[PDB]
Amino acid sequence: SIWDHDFLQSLNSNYTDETYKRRAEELKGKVKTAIKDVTEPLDQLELIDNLQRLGLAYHFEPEIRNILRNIHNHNKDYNWRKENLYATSLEFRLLRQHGYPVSQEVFSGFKDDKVGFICDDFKGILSLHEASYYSLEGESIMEEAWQFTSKHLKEMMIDVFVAEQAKRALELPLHWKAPMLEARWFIHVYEKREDKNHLLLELAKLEFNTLQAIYQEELKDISGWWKDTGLGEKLSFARNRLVASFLWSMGIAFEPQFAYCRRVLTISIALITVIDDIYDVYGTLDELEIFTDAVARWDINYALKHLPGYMKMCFLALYNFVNEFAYYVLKQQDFDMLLSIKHAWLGLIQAYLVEAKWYHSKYTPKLEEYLENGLVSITGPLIITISYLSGTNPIIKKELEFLESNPDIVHWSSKIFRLQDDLGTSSDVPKSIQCYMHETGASEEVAREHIKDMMRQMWKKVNAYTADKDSPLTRTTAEFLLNLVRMSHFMYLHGDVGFTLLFQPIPL
Ligand SMILES: CC(C)=CCC/C(C)=C(\F)COP(=O)(O)OP(=O)(O)O
Numbered sequence: 025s026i027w028d029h030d031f032l033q034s035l036n037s038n039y040t041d042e043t044y045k046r047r048a049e050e051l052k053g054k055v056k057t058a059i060k061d062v063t064e065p066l067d068q069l070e071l072i073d074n075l076q077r078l079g080l081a082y083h084f085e086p087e088i089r090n091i092l093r094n095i096h097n098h099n100k101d102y103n104w105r106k107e108n109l110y111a112t113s114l115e116f117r118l119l120r121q122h123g124y125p126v127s128q129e130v131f132s133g134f135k136d137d138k139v140g141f142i143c144d145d146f147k148g149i150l151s152l153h154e155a156s157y158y159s160l161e162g163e164s165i166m167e168e169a170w171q172f173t174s175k176h177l178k179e180m181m182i183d184v185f186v187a188e189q190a191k192r193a194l195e196l197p198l199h200w201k202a203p204m205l206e207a208r209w210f211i212h213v214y215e216k217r218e219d220k221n222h223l224l225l226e227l228a229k230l231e232f233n234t235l236q237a238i239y240q241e242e243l244k245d246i247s248g249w250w251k252d253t254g255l256g257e258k259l260s261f262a263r264n265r266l267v268a269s270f271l272w273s274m275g276i277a278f279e280p281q282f283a284y285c286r287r288v289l290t291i292s293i294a295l296i297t298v299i300d301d302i303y304d305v306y307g308t309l310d311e312l313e314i315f316t317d318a319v320a321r322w323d324i325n326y327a328l329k330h331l332p333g334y335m336k337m338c339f340l341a342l343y344n345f346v347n348e349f350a351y352y353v354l355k356q357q358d359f360d361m362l363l364s365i366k367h368a369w370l371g372l373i374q375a376y377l378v379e380a381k382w383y384h385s386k387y388t389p390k391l392e393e394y395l396e397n398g399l400v401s402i403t404g405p406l407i408i409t410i411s412y413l414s415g416t417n418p419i420i421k422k423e424l425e426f427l428e429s430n431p432d433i434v435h436w437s438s439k440i441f442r443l444q445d446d447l448g449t450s451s452d453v454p455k456s457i458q459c460y461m462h463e464t465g466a467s468e469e470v471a472r473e474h475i476k477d478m479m480r481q482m483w484k485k486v487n488a489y490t491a492d493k494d495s496p497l498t499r500t501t502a503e504f505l506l507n508l509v510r511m512s513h514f515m516y517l518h519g520d521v522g523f524t525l526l527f528q529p530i531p532l
């Protein structure tokens with residue numbers, strides 16, 4: 025909580041200057057021409073892998089789409105299949121990431137029916153491990169691939185760069201990282217390479233520092249808004265969690281075009297943090313019932329008349345914020361979404377009340393019963409509603425109605441979110457771990473392992489709903505939902521990398 029309002033206002037990064045923006049386009053063009061001279065399919069796959077891990081993929085989307093669509097037209101050729109675990113795993117991962125259909129049978133050549141997978145090459149095992157997280161439900165080869173690669177990678181810590189790659193893949197696979205999170209670490213790895221493209225490296229450093237400067241200017245505006253509402257002065261527990269909230273919004277939508285999306289997400293997460301503290305710490309059951317009814321009615325006159333003192337400003341801050349949110353969308357694209365966004369906030373508030381009633385009743389629900397309410401209380405359904413309404417123009421009515429129908433992809437992504445957040449609880453109200461221990465008798469350590477395995481199994485379900493080209497949700501909308509879950513995976517590992525992401529530039 026060191027990055028207060030005064031610190032954010034004092035920042036003055038250089039990379040908002042016009043000379044850097046000019047050198048950026050000068051690099052983009054000279055990088056696009058160099059992409060043309062990458063004709064080898066494996067070199068093309070490694071180019072896409074470098075572009076994505078450097079944080080530059082959104083600057084070359086058509087060029088990446090051309091490479092992958094041509095490799096997909098060729099991968100059915102007779103001599104295309106080669107007995108390389110690294111190359112086969114890299115192609116499998118990239119094509120499945122971008123929605124192209126690839127069968128798990130591309131790995132059967134490396135797997136003996138009786139002994140399993142036969143490999144000792146670390147580069148291929150590491151690539152196969154990352155490809156296993158793109159598995160679908162019931163792909164026994166991919167599940168067996170994960171068991172083989174996971175065991176082998178844990179044995180890597182019974183030269184020095186090998187052990188680090190093994191540790192990073194085990195704590196956070198590529199499929200579970202947001203793009204810009206791994207940008208800084210991979211830029212250093214790419215710099216130390218011999219075959220590195222020097223213009224690609226300079227572009228990655230220049231774009232990273234420009235992104236920080238854009239976020240810092242957004243934080244100045246968001247910091248002023250938070251200071252104006254004065255919630256931190258009225259509630260001594262409303263500690264400034266603004267930079268932490270912006271960190272989540274950055275992971276949900278990092279691109280500069282989503283500035284308003286990040287602003288609404290940051291303020292919403294900050295309000296959720298304050299409201300959550302009221303529902304499971306400071307509020308009494310009667311106070312929480314009134315606050316829930318006030319949210320349900322969405323009536324400022326009723327709320328000012330019936331709410332306790334410390335809840336009046338907390339409600340009116342949320343009330344005005346959401347109504348200004350609806351006004352902005354109405355001014356921007358003439359779409360009325362007040363009923364939708366208000367309905368989503370009430371769903372979270374009612375989920376908070378269910379947990380509050382369970383705590384006072386000293387009731388320990390079954391894990392399945394807890395996750396049904398817990399997937400809403402983790403704000404998954406609300407955050408994707410906020411992300412779509414603040415990050416899409418034009419808003420599609422049928423696409424918004426699909427999110428309101430409680431689709432399966434929101435159902436399982438929110439459960440992973442809830443399970444991952446509950447894993448952040450210390451060994452010292454029952455959560456996922458306690459409900460699972462009470463239900464199976466397993467120890468806390470074993471329960472954590474089984475819960476960690478549940479998330480990986482639920483990601484298989486999400487991988488199916490993401491590849492379905494027939495849902496009303498576009499590919500951009502689904503990335504909001506996945507990046508939210510990916511941020512939960514990232515925050516569980518780092519609970520200051522937030523400071524090194526927003527305020528610490530890459531020395532050019
Ligand atoms: C709101 C989002 C998406 C990100 C902010 C970080 C989180 C998880 C919270 F603020 C919720 O706190 P808490 O862990 O207390 O939530 P529960 O009380 O439901 O466990």
Ligand SMILES: [Mn+2]
Nearest residue numbers: 300303304379
């Ligand atoms: Mn809570």
Ligand SMILES: [Mn+2]
Nearest residue numbers: 300301304305
């Ligand atoms: Mn809480």
Ligand SMILES: [Mn+2]
Nearest residue numbers: 445446448449
């Ligand atoms: Mn929690």
